[PDB]
Enzyme design. Structure first.
Site, PDB file in Angstrom:
ATOM      1  CG  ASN A 117     -40.855 -10.724 -42.720  1.00  0.00           C
ATOM      2  OD1 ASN A 117     -41.525 -11.225 -41.833  1.00  0.00           O
ATOM      3  ND2 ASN A 117     -41.376 -10.184 -43.807  1.00  0.00           N
TER       4      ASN A 117
ATOM      5  CD  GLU B 176     -50.927  -8.392 -15.879  1.00  0.00           C
ATOM      6  OE1 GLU B 176     -52.106  -8.810 -15.950  1.00  0.00           O
ATOM      7  OE2 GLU B 176     -49.918  -9.072 -15.545  1.00  0.00           O
TER       8      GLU B 176
HETATM    9  N1  LIG Z   1     -44.160 -12.251 -42.510  1.00  0.00           N
HETATM   10  C1  LIG Z   1     -44.801 -11.718 -43.558  1.00  0.00           C
HETATM   11  N2  LIG Z   1     -44.337 -10.610 -44.126  1.00  0.00           N
HETATM   12  C2  LIG Z   1     -45.110 -10.211 -45.161  1.00  0.00           C
HETATM   13  C3  LIG Z   1     -46.250 -10.802 -45.656  1.00  0.00           C
HETATM   14  N3  LIG Z   1     -46.747 -10.083 -46.732  1.00  0.00           N
HETATM   15  C4  LIG Z   1     -45.911  -9.086 -46.865  1.00  0.00           C
HETATM   16  N4  LIG Z   1     -44.891  -9.111 -45.951  1.00  0.00           N
HETATM   17  C5  LIG Z   1     -43.815  -8.144 -45.811  1.00  0.00           C
HETATM   18  O1  LIG Z   1     -44.389  -6.860 -45.772  1.00  0.00           O
HETATM   19  C6  LIG Z   1     -43.574  -5.929 -46.526  1.00  0.00           C
HETATM   20  C7  LIG Z   1     -44.386  -5.408 -47.683  1.00  0.00           C
HETATM   21  O2  LIG Z   1     -45.611  -4.861 -47.164  1.00  0.00           O
HETATM   22  P1  LIG Z   1     -47.033  -5.479 -47.537  1.00  0.00           P
HETATM   23  O3  LIG Z   1     -47.781  -5.798 -46.293  1.00  0.00           O
HETATM   24  O4  LIG Z   1     -46.894  -6.544 -48.561  1.00  0.00           O
HETATM   25  O5  LIG Z   1     -47.691  -4.207 -48.233  1.00  0.00           O
HETATM   26  P2  LIG Z   1     -49.086  -3.509 -47.934  1.00  0.00           P
HETATM   27  O6  LIG Z   1     -49.181  -3.249 -46.480  1.00  0.00           O
HETATM   28  O7  LIG Z   1     -50.142  -4.298 -48.600  1.00  0.00           O
HETATM   29  O8  LIG Z   1     -48.861  -2.128 -48.697  1.00  0.00           O
HETATM   30  P3  LIG Z   1     -48.918  -1.751 -50.249  1.00  0.00           P
HETATM   31  O9  LIG Z   1     -49.043  -3.027 -50.987  1.00  0.00           O
HETATM   32  O10 LIG Z   1     -47.640  -1.046 -50.529  1.00  0.00           O
HETATM   33  O11 LIG Z   1     -50.105  -0.875 -50.400  1.00  0.00           O
HETATM   34  C8  LIG Z   1     -42.300  -6.702 -46.884  1.00  0.00           C
HETATM   35  O12 LIG Z   1     -41.314  -6.519 -45.880  1.00  0.00           O
HETATM   36  C9  LIG Z   1     -42.825  -8.139 -46.968  1.00  0.00           C
HETATM   37  O13 LIG Z   1     -41.840  -9.126 -46.787  1.00  0.00           O
HETATM   38  C10 LIG Z   1     -46.739 -11.979 -45.044  1.00  0.00           C
HETATM   39  O14 LIG Z   1     -47.735 -12.640 -45.348  1.00  0.00           O
HETATM   40  N5  LIG Z   1     -45.930 -12.368 -43.980  1.00  0.00           N
END
Ligand SMILES: Nc1nc2c(ncn2[C@@H]2O[C@H](COP(=O)(O)OP(=O)(O)OP(=O)(O)O)[C@@H](O)[C@H]2O)c(=O)[nH]1
Ligand SMILES: Nc1nc2c(ncn2[C@@H]2O[C@H](COP(=O)(O)OP(=O)(O)O)[C@@H](O)[C@H]2O)c(=O)[nH]1
Ligand SMILES: COc1ccc(CCc2nc3cc(OC)c(OC)c(OC)c3s2)cc1O
Ligand SMILES: [Ca+2]
Ligand SMILES: [Mg+2]
Lengths: 435, 430, 155
Positions: A205, A253
């Site tokens: 990120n 692959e």
């Molecule tokens: N690149 C990117 N990172 C994301 C996004 N949404 C969340 N993150 C990252 O994912 C992490 C948080 O996890 P999430 O995916 O939001 O959480 P989840 O998997 O829904 O899990 P819980 O909400 O804890 O049940 C952090 O590092 C955020 O910056 C997105 O749309 N894009």
């Protein structure tokens, strides 16, 4: 051979939403699933069919499952521009999320829905004539992305033993973070998924953030900006699965070309060029320029310095107006002029794939159209720097057992933290030993 | 994770609870009758968190009002939004507890606690996705502290997987020179250490100091104190009740704010500080909010954050302002004040912006898990010990059935709590 | 045993019962098991009139219980300003030290009884008196961030 994409938790769902939008635009599939250039109505054997099934009505349906433990993010897919694209039963939501807690995603909350997810996946698998395996998108830092994914991968390994499991993993960055415990979730899911995943493309990120700010002049990138850049990269990585081509044409692959040994299965993606859409009249960069840019750390999906590492594999995936002899010439001028050091046991060579269609721009995106683009996939020991940074944050908190009570209260043994962390230490050694 | 069941117990608890429902109803477009007059929709997207949508597009506070003293029910009803509460949700006794925690916890209050639970059950069973509970109570009295903590313990048993959050008003002789209040507080703190996931320590000492030293109010009233509370309570709950770029619930807050189960006492802080009516509309710059929200004079617990270290901090900026500025200013405070944050919790400061402000143009609300809060616990421990060494008034408590050993156990648990705080204040990364 | 009854009457604030017991030979200086006298109890429970009456009948204004508490200690702890003054006017030792090294000033300060603090100071309370842990009342004010107290103590 079909590929099923599974998108877990918010990051996996939001990135999946962005990827499938791009896929549709690349393949000429409309938001309702109609594909006019598709001559076969019943179904068919075309390359894009690895990702899309076809109904009798001519609807081209993503071979995709979206799972989240809370419904807010997936409800957006349900009500968005691509509401009609997806199997409604392939968007699965619980009611209450994992609270940024690996153990809730994996042990408590995640168990309430795991069998539904597997049954829905089985329904997609059963529509497959030759399932190659799965692309699993998820965050490392989320409780669902981390804990439910590892649960899911564990189950998929049991039920689909011969099937490849590739992951697109979002590696946490402070600049766009959701929790203090994300280093924990990251080590925990990495430890428990390491055995079950054949190849994992980590998206840092922070790297994407920095690219959005530097190349796209976006002052405070949001998820939408990040996810648009990521989907361009994911599309470049999966293009070979979806289009005719000669490199990485199936999931196996990928492991063959990029994973010399099972555990060091984290290829570095580098992408170029990334040019702001405000520069619509930008000079077109040559094959040599964009290939050179793949060895700039600034274009990397993961922050690390490959000059500090050894390469074990390197694939160059070009898209667009790319003359093969110009690729060869640029590779010759990189094999001599740049400090690229392969390990001594690996052919010091570059695999090259060229899709002659330039990348698609998403309307509303931040990216300028370009005539040629390149995604380099490399397995380099410098990615161990990313693990080291994560492992250090983990160690700072675990030394004091900060936050650990949250995990133990959610069905997890404290010893799982040490086992995970030792597995990471061994992973770090695996990269030193290889060099 | 959506509905919060709010409970307010005792005179302080009902009094700041009523103030809370006024301030946030107003913030959500709700009027004293339940009708939404809001000019913006996101005022209702997250309304379900604190309100049951009744009949007539009516919004009723998911609020249970409890007190062993019948009197406060009337003052609650005489209140502005006193008719907004479900009449079935007023659970009131007849005698009161007379500032005796043992009456609240073991005798009078144990009589009434089942009546309160029934209502809690009703309100909980009508919840799509209950996230947990919020209780408003004083620690210095008998009902809020004694019955409150009994009410917390009982709710905890029946709803063990839900978040228990309190707004707990710490006693101060500056506001109530009643000498049994340290007893009541200490007995209550012992309860809160084990049965709550998150406690906002709202310190009457601090509230008085702010009013007197900063707001130049020479004779602060509860109304003046409660203006600081309600602003604080609105601030700290902003992100439970407004969409924003954060999907905030009580549990994600707990997981990221509580590194150790017992260290769940938060020091809230608020900027700008204002008196009731005060035409202090001068505004404030992001760098100013950011500094002030981090100043001892802005803390609602009489603790100097610069005497301890911040384990975790969550800050909610409210109003129109560059999230990029807040990002920069917050990094600024973190690096200029690096030695006041623990180094072994990376990225332990979390910032949210929320466009809707409280009734000013810009506010910052601080939620600190700071080791400096041991100063509050030490203050109470010392008063407790002064009284307890002489056994003053112990008979008021033992005569209600309490054992003298419950006092020594509370005091020990509080002394242990202060040591834990000092332990992490002195810990280093190496 | 009228002494035991005087103690209860003193604790309970029964002025008439105090007057009667004294008149029937009750030991004004009777002690409970803790060494508390009627005057200790009246001072603790805020019975100003009983305090005055005991003191006109031979109460030892400086009696100590088993822990060294004088009536002034308890009145200062509990915060009864008028009893504090009445005790001082009848010879209470403003600097009496109990078994924790606490002076009445220490207890009034800890408990935030600022008016009592002022009164004790005007009556010669020793601001250098240290409790068993070395704290003077001023230290308590500084340690606890009680600026109101600390201003009073700096006079
Ligand atoms: N690149 C990117 N990172 C994301 C996004 N949404 C969340 N993150 C990252 O994912 C992490 C948080 O996890 P999430 O995916 O939001 O959480 P989840 O998997 O829904 O899990 P819980 O909400 O804890 O049940 C952090 O590092 C955020 O910056 C997105 O749309 N894009
Ligand atoms: N800030 C504030 N504190 C209060 C209020 N009412 C009482 N308190 C405090 O609460 C303590 C007394 O307990 P109280 O809540 O009145 O009694 P209860 O009926 O037993 O809960 C003292 O420390 C008071 O200063 C109020 O309206 N506001
Ligand atoms: C310390 O570092 C973090 C702290 C918490 C988290 C996520 C969860 C959060 N929930 C809320 C809820 C809030 O109000 C109830 C609130 O203030 C109004 C909040 O602060 C903005 C937050 S932050 C992640 C972190 O990295
Ligand atoms: Ca077809
Ligand atoms: Mg989520």
């Amino acid at each position: 051979r079909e590929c099923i994409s599974i998108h877990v938790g918010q990051a996996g769902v939001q990135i999946g939403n962005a990827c499938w939008e791009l896929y549709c635009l690349e393949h000429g599939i409309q938001p309702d699933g109609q594909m006019p250039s598709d001559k076969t109505i019943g179904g068919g054997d075309d390359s894009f069919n690895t990702f899309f099934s076809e109904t009798g009505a001519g609807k081209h349906v993503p071979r995709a499952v979206f799972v989240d433990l809370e419904p807010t993010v997936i409800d957006e897919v349900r009500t968005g521009t691509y509401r009609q694209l997806f199997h409604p039963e392939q968007l699965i939501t619980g009611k209450e999320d994992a609270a940024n807690n690996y153990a809730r995603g994996h042990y408590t909350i995640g168990k309430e829905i795991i069998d539904l997810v597997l049954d829905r996946i089985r329904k997609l698998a059963d529509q497959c004539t030759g399932l190659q395996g799965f692309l699993v998108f998820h965050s490392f830092g989320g409780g669902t992305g981390s804990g439910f994914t590892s649960l899911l991968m564990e189950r998929l390994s049991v039920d689909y033993g011969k099937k490849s499991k590739l992951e697109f993993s979002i590696y946490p960055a402070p600049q766009v973070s959701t929790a203090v415990v994300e280093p924990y979730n990251s080590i925990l899911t990495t430890h428990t998924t390491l055995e079950h995943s054949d190849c994992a493309f980590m998206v840092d990120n922070e790297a994407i953030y920095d690219i959005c700010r530097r190349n796209l002049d976006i002052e405070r990138p949001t998820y939408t900006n990040l996810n648009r850049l990521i989907s361009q990269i994911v599309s470049s990585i999966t293009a070979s699965l979806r289009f005719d081509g000669a490199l990485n044409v199936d999931l196996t692959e990928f492991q063959t070309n990029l994973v010399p040994y099972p555990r060091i299965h984290f290829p570095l993606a580098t992408y170029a060029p990334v040019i702001s859409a405000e520069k619509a009249y930008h000079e077109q960069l040559s094959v040599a320029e964009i290939t050179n840019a793949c060895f700039e750390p600034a274009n990397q999906m993961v922050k690390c310095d490959p000059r500090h590492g050894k390469y074990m594999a390197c694939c160059l995936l070009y898209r667009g107006d790319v003359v093969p002899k110009d690729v060869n010439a640029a590779i010759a001028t990189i094999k001599t002029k740049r400090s690229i050091q392969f390990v001594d046991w690996c052919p010091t060579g570059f695999k090259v794939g060229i899709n002659y269609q330039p990348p698609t721009v998403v309307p509303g995106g931040d990216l300028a159209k370009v005539q040629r683009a390149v995604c380099m996939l490399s397995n380099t020991t410098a990615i161990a720097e990313a693990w080291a940074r994560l492992d250090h944050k983990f160690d700072l908190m675990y030394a004091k057992r900060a936050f650990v009570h949250w995990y133990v209260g959610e069905g997890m043994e404290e010893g799982e933290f040490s086992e995970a962390r030792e597995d990471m230490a061994a992973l770090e050694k695996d990269y030193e030993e290889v060099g | 994770m959506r509905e919060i069941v709010h409970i307010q117990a005792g005179q302080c608890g009902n009094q700041i609870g009523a103030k809370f429902w006024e301030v946030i109803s107003d913030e959500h477009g709700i009027d004293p009758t339940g009708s939404y007059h809001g000019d913006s929709d996101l005022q209702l997207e997250r309304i379900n968190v604190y309100y049951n949508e009744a009949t007539g597009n009516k919004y009723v506070p998911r609020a249970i009002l409890v007190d062993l003293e019948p009197g406060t029910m009337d003052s609650v009803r005489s209140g502005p939004f006193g008719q907004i509460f479900r009449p079935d949700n007023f659970v009131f006794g007849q005698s009161g507890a007379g500032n005796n925690w043992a009456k609240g916890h073991y005798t009078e209050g144990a009589e009434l606690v089942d009546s309160v639970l029934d209502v809690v059950r009703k309100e909980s069973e009508s919840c799509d996705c209950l996230q947990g509970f919020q209780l408003t109570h004083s620690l210095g009295g008998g009902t809020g502290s004694g019955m409150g903590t009994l009410l917390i313990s009982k709710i905890r048993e029946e709803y063990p997987d839900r978040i228990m959050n309190t707004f707990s008003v710490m006693p101060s002789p500056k506001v109530s020179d009643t000498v049994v209040e340290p007893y009541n507080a200490t007995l209550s703190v012992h309860q809160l250490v084990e049965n709550t996931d998150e406690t906002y320590c709202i310190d009457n000492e601090a509230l008085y100091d702010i009013c007197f030293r900063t707001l130049k109010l020479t004779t602060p009233t509860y109304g003046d104190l409660n203006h600081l509370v309600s602003a604080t309570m609105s601030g700290v709950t902003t992100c439970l009740r407004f969409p924003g770029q954060l999907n905030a619930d009580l549990r994600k807050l707990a997981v990221n704010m509580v590194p150790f189960p017992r260290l769940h006492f938060f020091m809230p802080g608020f900027a700008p500080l204002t008196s009731r009516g005060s035409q202090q509309y001068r505004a404030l710059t992001v760098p100013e909010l950011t500094q002030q929200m981090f100043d001892s004079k802005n803390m609602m617990a009489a603790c100097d954050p610069r005497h301890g270290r911040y384990l975790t901090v969550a800050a909610i900026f409210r109003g129109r302002m560059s999230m990029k500025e807040v990002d920069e200013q917050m990094l600024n405070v973190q690096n200029k004040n690096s030695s006041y944050f623990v180094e072994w919790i990376p990225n332990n400061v979390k910032t949210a912006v929320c466009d809707i402000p409280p009734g000013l143009k810009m506010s910052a609300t601080f939620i600190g898990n700071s080791t400096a809060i041991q100063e509050l616990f030490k203050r109470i421990s010392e008063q407790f010990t002064a009284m307890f060494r002489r056994k003053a008034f112990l008979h008021w408590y033992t005569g209600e059935g309490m054992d003298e050993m419950e006092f020594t156990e509370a005091e020990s648990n509080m002394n242990d709590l202060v040591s834990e705080y000092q332990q992490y204040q002195d810990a280093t990364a190496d | 045993d009228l002494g035991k009854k005087l103690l209860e009457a003193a604790r309970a604030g029964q002025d008439d019962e105090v007057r009667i017991l004294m008149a029937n030979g009750a030991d004004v200086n009777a002690t409970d098991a803790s060494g508390l006298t009627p005057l200790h109890l009246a001072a603790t429970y805020g019975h100003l009139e009983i305090v005055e009456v005991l003191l006109k009948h031979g109460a030892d204004v400086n009696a100590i219980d088993i822990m060294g508490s004088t009536p002034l200690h308890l009145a200062a702890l509990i915060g009864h300003l008028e009893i504090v003054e009445v005790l001082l006017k009848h010879g209470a030792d403003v600097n009496a030290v109990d078994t924790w090294g606490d002076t009445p000033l220490h207890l009034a300060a800890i408990m935030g009884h600022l008016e009592i603090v002022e009164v004790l100071l005007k009556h010669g309370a020793d601001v250098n008196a240290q409790d068993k842990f070395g704290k003077t009342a001023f230290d308590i004010s500084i340690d606890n961030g009680n600026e109101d107290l600390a201003e009073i103590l700096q006079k």
